[PDB]
Design a protein around this ligand. Sequence first.
Ligand SMILES: CN1CCCC[C@@H]1Cn1ccc2ccc(-c3n[nH]c(N)c3C#N)cc21
Ligand SMILES: CN1CCCC[C@@H]1Cn1ccc2ccc(-c3n[nH]c(N)c3C#N)cc21
Lengths: 205, 216
Amino acid sequence: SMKIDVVTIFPEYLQPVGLVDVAVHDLRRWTHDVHKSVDDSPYGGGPGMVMKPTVWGDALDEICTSETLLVVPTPAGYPFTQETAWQWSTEDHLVIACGRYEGIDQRVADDAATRMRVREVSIGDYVLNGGEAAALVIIEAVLRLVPGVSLLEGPSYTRPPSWRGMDVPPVLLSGDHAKIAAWRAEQSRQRTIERRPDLLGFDSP
Amino acid sequence: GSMKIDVVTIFPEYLQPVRQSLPGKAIDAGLVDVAVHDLRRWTHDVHKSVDDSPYGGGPGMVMKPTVWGDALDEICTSETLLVVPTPAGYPFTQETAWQWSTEDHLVIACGRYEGIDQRVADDAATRMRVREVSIGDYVLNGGEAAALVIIEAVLRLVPGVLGNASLLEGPSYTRPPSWRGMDVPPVLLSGDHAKIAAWRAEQSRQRTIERRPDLL
Ligand SMILES: CN1CCCC[C@@H]1Cn1ccc2ccc(-c3n[nH]c(N)c3C#N)cc21
Ligand SMILES: CN1CCCC[C@@H]1Cn1ccc2ccc(-c3n[nH]c(N)c3C#N)cc21
């Protein structure tokens, strides 16, 4: 049983989402001024804008409890991996705070950490415009692990056994479980060495 | 630059996010076009079958090569960069996003279930460039979320699409100067911009050591 709340200034972007419920909240609901302003220029200089702590604080005050796991996507986060997804799969309540612009004032996470568990994480080594796509990835990876819901995968094949003059590897038609398991292990080894040598403790290309 | 992206998926509704996030100015200027295609348009049968049992046995289903082959035959040309998300892919990184941002035509083939029969990519690779990539070390249900990430990372690097007409980033702060007992680091308000840059560099150094020692 899991509840997921996502907070964002682009609730429309979260559209791609019994044991689990997902709710999406417009951060601007917690603004007061007429312009509904969520950002301001950075202290210390630099390009762009920073999301104000005040609006975030009010939103999280309402949505979070001390049991909440607050997830904050950021390119400067700890890596979000399958291990993380397993860890989070047994949580009762995830709140995902999606930033935009240059990000969220650091005091939002620091304040939250005084009363709940906070996790700043990155889904990969590339740059996005905001946390929303990361939220979608995290939700998908976690929800498929919720109770009641090493080597790279090798290639898969289905019918027909010959297509455009390309044959399904004959071993896969042999019915020999041991030979098939061995061939699959070898394809996975080839793939992992070639594409992800770091997974086997080798230098990255 | 002008980029066309075609996405093929059995869940086209999953991609409408991307089409919405695109600035009208970039579309009107013909800088970008994203089109999403339902794979079932290319099925052969009244049951609109896209999957079948795996040769060699095992769990799950495999997407059919004949359906995918027809879809890609129609959509791709010799100039296409065919992107195939897969957890067994080469890592998709910012370097990748930069490389792909100058392409004229990306086609993203989104799999589901166990993935796509390998002959689809292998056949495509004999007449176009094919890239099997993964967006990270976690398992998804299919390629659609990966497509969203790749599209966003690539398009924001295409001149015009964003507009205006190594180390980890450190913390950022804005008003108010004090909030819930927490003060913005005073150095940031000091007007000593050389010292501010050094402070930021050290914050970045510390964060990289703590969160991403692999980058060092
Ligand atoms: C661009 N713009 C200036 C520099 C830094 C980032 C900023 C955009 N931005 C704002 C909030 C926010 C949250 C997550 C991500 C994100 N990018 N890449 C990942 N793997 C991410 C995660 N997880 C990016 C975000
Ligand atoms: C689960 N199910 C059985 C095992 C293998 C994967 C499969 C699901 N699935 C089918 C097509 C497909 C494409 C990409 C991804 C994907 N997962 N994680 C990434 N970083 C990905 C990328 N990029 C998963 C996909």
